[PDB]
Amino acid sequence: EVSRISYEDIGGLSEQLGKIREMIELPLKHPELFERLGITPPKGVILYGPPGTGKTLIARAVANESGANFLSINGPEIMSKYYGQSEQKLREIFSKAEETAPSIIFIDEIDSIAPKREEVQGEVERRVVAQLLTLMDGMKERGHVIVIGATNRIDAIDPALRRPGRFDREIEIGVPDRNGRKEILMIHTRNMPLGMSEEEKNKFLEEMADYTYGFVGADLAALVRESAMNALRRYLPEIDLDKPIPTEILEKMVVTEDDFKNALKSIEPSSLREVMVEVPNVHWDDIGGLEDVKREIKETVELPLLKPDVFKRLGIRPSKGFLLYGPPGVGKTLLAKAVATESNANFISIKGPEVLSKWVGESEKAIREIFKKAKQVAPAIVFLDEIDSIAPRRGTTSDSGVTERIVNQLLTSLDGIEVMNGVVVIGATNRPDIMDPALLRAGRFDKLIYIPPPDKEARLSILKVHTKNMPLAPDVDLNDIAQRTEGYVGADLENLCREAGMNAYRENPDATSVSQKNFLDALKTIRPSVDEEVIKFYRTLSET
């Protein structure tokens, strides 16, 4: 096969891939670079990534990069052969490296040499562990030998291998970026046939990933397979005549971009349970009213990250974040995404149901992992929704998960975040009081920004922005409903415009421009979720 694993295969790993390649090649082409400054390159390296992220693929490309002799050793077969000859085999590879040195010691998907740090007492497991530690020991500075590895679990590997002088440098490659997803799906398109250069399809492939925040590379490379198999069904019967494929019609059946759109289903993506990063596309234009908060909230979040220097000339402490509180449906979930979306900085999404929900929850650490993933990805703004559920007051809930896993965990995490650090915490919840008052302590959350319900005058703006996609009638006027009622939120009016469609649809089977009457009947169909009684609740709850 003239075509072999090369860089162009990998995609979206450019920063990580670049660093790994640089370490190997700079050390590999010649030691003189590291030989002169700093220690020789660390022999062992661990590539920690979610499964099916391409780690296995990375090593081959690395091997082709400097031309060093390729070797690949796998945990599944490391101990494959019968016990007592396993150890001999492990030693043999190390012996093998010097002959072709400079060479690359290559093994992947290794849970076998270190099945568990302290849990497994098996001798076959133990013997290999020992030899490995020693081979690491048997490795010498002169040798152009590089050791590599990947694993599903970061800490699943032995802790001891962690001390430096063995596995000193580790780089973990995560899910590919939205633009990175294209590279993966783009390359496989080469074999994939579309009939034309189809830069639009390329642009189509661009959006193909955008249909979801992202997935694992492996599954993505499998997604393209779905289209082939699936799309092949339509043209498959015509060939049932005989076994040999007719040359009359040969490769004139091409997978249509719609095939993928039909292929995305049934492929059961989202095999990754790891913390994810997502950037929403919402824009302030989608935000009606609230000119004051947006203008101030923006300068609050944007200033520290975008203009840190000008913020230091004053000297006041930078903000660790702020919390949002108001009537349900004021758009908290929508606002945060806006500021986060507007800012280039990476975004992170946290859900109160999901935090208990996302993992076993036996350990609420996921949250402690959030900042770690957030800190590394900084500058970024972390978002926590329904922080109350996540951090209910301590007395109310008799559970380990509520207090032990998170509320206690939460105070510690906030201190860790730093102003220089590009991390920022934006909370939103229905009832501020429900959450532990401990979070309102000075320095944990600087200010509490209340979101007032949409004003009738603001209603005039809130309505157009949402119905812009909706076809409207020439006679129907939006401001009418605004002047009618002062009690409706944005969330209720959300469904309000929603129900209007049903009303307009109910009269006429085929869709037509909505009518003012279509709002009135629906206007009384859903009453305001916010009365003058609750407004006082927050007005008083604004102090605590």
Added chain:
Amino acid sequence: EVSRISYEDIGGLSEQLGKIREMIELPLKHPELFERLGITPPKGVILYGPPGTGKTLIARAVANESGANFLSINGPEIMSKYYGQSEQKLREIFSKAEETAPSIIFIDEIDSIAPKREEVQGEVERRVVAQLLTLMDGMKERGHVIVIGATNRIDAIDPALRRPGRFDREIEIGVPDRNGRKEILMIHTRNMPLGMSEEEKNKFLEEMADYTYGFVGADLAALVRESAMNALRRYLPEIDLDKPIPTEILEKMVVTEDDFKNALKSIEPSSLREVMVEVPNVHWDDIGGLEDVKREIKETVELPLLKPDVFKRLGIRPSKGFLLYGPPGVGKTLLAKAVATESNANFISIKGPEVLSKWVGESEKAIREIFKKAKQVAPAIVFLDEIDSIAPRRGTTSDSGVTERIVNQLLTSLDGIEVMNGVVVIGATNRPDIMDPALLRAGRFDKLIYIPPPDKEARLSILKVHTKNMPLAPDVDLNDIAQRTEGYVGADLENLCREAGMNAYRENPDATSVSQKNFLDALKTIRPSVDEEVIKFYRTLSET
């Protein structure tokens, strides 16, 4: 390699290193010192330290210290070789020592000979255990043989090895001191090239560690590696032309001190979860008002530790400590650090969220470990913040962690501390009543010092101290806001001066001197967190 492991490599271990060296060398150069007085030096010794603290390194230096024949035996490879030949190998080393005696029996990172005290029943594990106990047994008084070892877990080693006559003396080296951190980072600078003697950089290196309380030595030695790798990236492309390094530009690329500042990130320090020691730099000048409390609190803490003798001439019992209670934001967290910071005595920091939070919390022992780390490090003052969370009243919380791990544990710990002992307990919490009244029993906490909210007259001082770093306007006067409102704490005014910057920034894009109006608009932006209603709460809560 002419350069080999020597004392100068180690740093910050001077007391511990000195003691170990003395034990080996005094015994090693000649027995006559110990031979005449006291028993011969204990053959076995265990060096207990957090991982990556340099323990491994210590043995080599010790070996070079008296010139005794070096031998190093490691747990990873102790049992490395196939079972049934492992035991023979262990015996062989002991046999080996006499030939070159005086010699040093040297093995490190040993969990293998004693994988677990009672948990592991493996024969290979057991056989070695037995031989080890016996070799300890086979060791004889005449022999100039010294046995050493390190482990992550102190009690992880077998309990039996603990009885004297085997492993009698143990010294554990912890995290290096702030000044000690310099030694580590300083020595590696030798290979590290800066272009000049750069005593400033040395002073720069001085502060390099001060950016954080501290870390593990190993990681620190790795930190310098980050700069090399990271800093090498800027000058790395220019060499892409060919593999051989051009002699035209040779070592004219030097790591800049800013590189480290850029290197500190991404290095994921703080791999140590052990109890830590930190000394804050706060000074009373940073403390506005409260002339009475500081003057009295100082004489309360300082007197016993600094002037114990003059305190004994009276004869009254010394103080085990005292508790602080007052409105949130009165500066409790700030005051304690001040007195602790002012005093040379080492400081310890305890957080209520963190204590549940810091470890699994299944065992609240960490706290019992606190004093142990505190007692050994005395004279020092232990600090517990939000003692309520840590020690809520027993009836309110239905949890094992709250009562079993700590409140019950707490009473026992206090008795252990002694007046001669330089340990002192300074508590602070929002609500004294919330904590178990059991802590107010006589002798546990002598007095309860209430911190009154900042007085308007004191406000005049509180404001300047905080804004000293802030550029101010010639017309703007500080006392104005003081005479306006009697209800603001220090913590709220904290943000108050904070929000002022935003106000001043909001008008003018580039930062300029603040204006009186900038305070007024913000003055009403945040109302006092303490009204005349809460003051009565503490006024009455002052009795219990």
